Amino acid sequence: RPLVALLDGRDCTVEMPILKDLATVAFCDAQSTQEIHEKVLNEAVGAMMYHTITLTREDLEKFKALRVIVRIGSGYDNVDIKAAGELGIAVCNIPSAAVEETADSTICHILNLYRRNTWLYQALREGTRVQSVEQIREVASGAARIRGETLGLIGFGRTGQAVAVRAKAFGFSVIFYDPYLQDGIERSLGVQRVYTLQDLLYQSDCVSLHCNLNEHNHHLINDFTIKQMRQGAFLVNAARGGLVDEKALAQALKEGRIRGAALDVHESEPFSFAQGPLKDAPNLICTPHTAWYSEQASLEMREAAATEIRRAITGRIPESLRNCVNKEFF
Amino acid sequence: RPLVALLDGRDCTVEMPILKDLATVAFCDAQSTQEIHEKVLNEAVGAMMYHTITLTREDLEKFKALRVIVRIGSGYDNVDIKAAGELGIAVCNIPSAAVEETADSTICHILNLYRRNTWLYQALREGTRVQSVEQIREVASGAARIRGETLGLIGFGRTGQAVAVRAKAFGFSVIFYDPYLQDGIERSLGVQRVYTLQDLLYQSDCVSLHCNLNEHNHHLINDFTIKQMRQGAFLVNAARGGLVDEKALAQALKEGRIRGAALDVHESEPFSFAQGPLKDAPNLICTPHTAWYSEQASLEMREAAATEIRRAITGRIPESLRNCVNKEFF
Ligand SMILES: NC(=O)c1ccc[n+]([C@@H]2O[C@H](COP(=O)([O-])OP(=O)(O)OC[C@H]3O[C@@H](n4cnc5c(N)ncnc54)[C@H](O)[C@@H]3O)[C@@H](O)[C@H]2O)c1
């Protein structure tokens, strides 16, 4: 009775009942390929994984029985999907369990930068006494009127579109760059499109990343491209950490070129304020990779990922799969 | 000789040039009526004030020459407007310079409660290491899916309407209670209206205050009315401290009856985390009365307040005044 392994997790309680009758389900709690037990490498027919482990070409070669990998989540940058396909392994994601969570979190980050809600809380926790009106304007200095500001989205897929839909009512003028989209989405949703990243950076008061990390967009925001942003612009990144060169950003924040940054994701996670290139960088908001999370979203995606494995066993791979991201399979 | 005094401020630089040619402008920097210099009491024809000082009946009687009071801001709970009118003193506000600023800040608070952005930032500042996916769920525990939740607005005026316009796109179902509004606003803006406070509290997952503080709504949210709210509801107050009995809220938070509260305003300002009935209360966000502030908003309202004073001198009081809130005048 086929083995299905949950690679980088301990909890397996949603997935077991959905698959009890078809497969033996197990967890590895492996943070790296080295830690995966020999039995799983040899016999596992299916694997489920989060974002905290990476499977390279060499790693995927170590599995002697694997037929399908399912990412519990939308992102699949952490799996070499081209090597997977060449070795006869289908890779799937769960693209839509946490769209709205993520947009909501993104807007929250934007609003926190514009209205300084998080920093004002911090100022009070640090014990600042704000009595007079002059002191209010001092403490809240930089809090800005949103109406008229331009919000620039890099990547206008599921999360990007979701953010756009929320930004309009605050008076943001929304603009996007996505060089892979077909013509027309801009017209449907009544937003403006630009056709180079430079245009987007030149025109945006707040730039937010919503593109998937791929072969061609590592360090999209880098030493060069940051200099193309407006003086005193805002940067928001709830997409993936490798999209941003944190050394570049660090300097930009120190020199005032970027007024502030809000990051849910980082080059090196888990994030710490004591460590890394952003060590002593001012005007930084960070959260620990939570944009996706809600009780309801977590359950939805686990259930969906169990269902996908179920399809892979009962049907034919890759035709039966709902969300297979690698038809350069076989 | 006309004297115009800025009662509770030091900064006078926007107002002087607008009034240079008509009146002498002066500032008191008084935090209480006792601190206002004898000259201002005797000769001041006009006064401008913020929210940090109060004028009672007794206080207003000490002015031997005052004809007009202008609140730089929309709130006028801190001035006995009926006493003012009876003593021949017109009271005006600036009702619309900071509507969108406030709604933006309000939504930011709402989203901070639902997505825990500020508390996750705090958890990172405190040095929490969030490595595994299980640790992400743990630290972000309580982060909730918004779509489907009901947002209940108490007071559906300028700020309330502005929050409703923003909430829709997140999937909130918006409900309101405002017993002074005429029939029909509900229909115009496509939101539902309830006709008692109890019905609003019963049906709301998140309750947000947007009513002006008046004779009849002090401690609107009190020991009795909090018990009418749903188990695990959220409370947001960017309207006025005084609307909420902080002793009652404090116990509610400790007992879990309210899942979290975000307050920009407090019974006793300036707020401190070391002091008051909320001293050791869990799941609290507070900002130090900033919801109104932006560089652009602050300028607009000071300029408007100066222009109102200008009308009072040049024209007949109260007819020439744009936003006079007390026709029980003379
Ligand atoms: N922080 C979180 O918890 C969280 C949650 C969900 C998703 N995400 C991240 O956000 C990403 C986007 O999510 P999604 O479901 O909306 O993806 P999606 O498939 O719906 O959209 C991504 C878009 O990015 C575009 N794109 C790729 N490279 C680009 C580039 N260099 N410049 C501009 N556009 C580019 C693509 O064409 C695509 O339309 C995911 O891949 C994931 O990494 C993060």
Ligand SMILES: NC(=O)c1ccc[n+]([C@@H]2O[C@H](COP(=O)([O-])OP(=O)(O)OC[C@H]3O[C@@H](n4cnc5c(N)ncnc54)[C@H](O)[C@@H]3O)[C@@H](O)[C@H]2O)c1
């Ligand atoms: N946080 C801030 O710095 C900030 C900024 C602006 C306004 N405010 C406060 O918000 C309040 C409202 O602002 P606004 O400009 O929208 O005023 P508004 O006059 O346009 O709205 C007030 C509404 O609340 C209603 N209301 C009064 N008493 C009520 C009650 N007891 N129960 C339910 N509804 C009631 C009124 O009928 C009216 O429709 C003011 O008191 C103001 O001080 C705070």
